[model samples]
Target: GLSDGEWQQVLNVWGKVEADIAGHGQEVLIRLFTGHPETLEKFDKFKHLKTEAEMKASEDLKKHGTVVLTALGGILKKKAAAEAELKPLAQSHATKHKIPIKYLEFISDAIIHVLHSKHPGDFGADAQGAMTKALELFRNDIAAKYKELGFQG
Candidate 1:
């Protein structure tokens, strides 16, 4: 849904922001769980953890955060191709974890927030808009698959 230049801008901003995830991977999950506390109930492994600090200290959060960051980087690596890349992520989060697409919005917001903080001018409005558009494609695809796989735990 974005032009080549727009895609390029998204990629450039992502390259800058994704690099910052190296040490702060867990921040993504922290941001998600803290911003939407109820969403924590869905992750069985994470349900027990109450506070943001506890969740961050848990190794499970770190591991899952790593996977989430890795998958995110891979999905956002290229331009508008390999939309298939989002399939497994969508399926696992939807069918298995039951991660509603709304949580994806929270996650997206955190990512954009982090991206902006990581580099102020680098992630300009155009870049942010482009990435948002691209991510909507993935979110829609995931929501569609999740809707289709009703009754699955």
Candidate 2:
């Protein structure tokens, strides 16, 4: 079991990642759909509609974001389970969409790299080195694909 601080860290990371990806239009949307069907359905139902000028109207975004964040939280609570779910979906998405699996790994590795770089000596040396390696390998492999897909670096 994770301590409260650890759980909060996970949630903060997940929320940031989700919001960042959501800023991209469709590919991330599809990935989210594939990963969490129910949450995507809820997101889809209102994501297309214009927001009405009422306090209650905001609930749709709140509910969907909460559901997404909650699902991410659940995954964070179980590291192995989170990896199990993400790895296969990433593999499948790579095979189906021709988006290299390394790109997905790159995103994760880059996040770790940024986190560690900004907070020097915070993460273990081994873990930081590993993430750097993963990010480099992923970047090399997906350079062309990222250009083609117009993904943010």
TM-scores for candidates 1 onward, in order: 0.83, 0.30
Question: For this target, which candidate reaches the highest TM-score against the unseen true structure?
Answer: 1
Superposed model 1: Cα runs more than 4 Å off = 150-153
Clashes of each: 0, 0
Instruction: Kindly list the per-residue Cα lDDT of model 1 for residues 1-153, writing each as its tens digit.
Output: 779887787777766656666445677788878888887888888988888779768987888787787787677765556558877776677666777778888888877676676676767788888878877766676677676767232
Candidate 1, residue 110: lDDT? 76
Q: lDDT by residue for model 2 over 5-86, one digit each (tens)? A: 5445555555554654432222333334344343333333644543223313445444544554344345454542355544
Q: After superposing candidate 2, which stretches have Cα over 4 Å from the reference?
A: 1-76, 83-98, 126-153
| Deviation (Å) of 90 in candidate 2 | 4.1
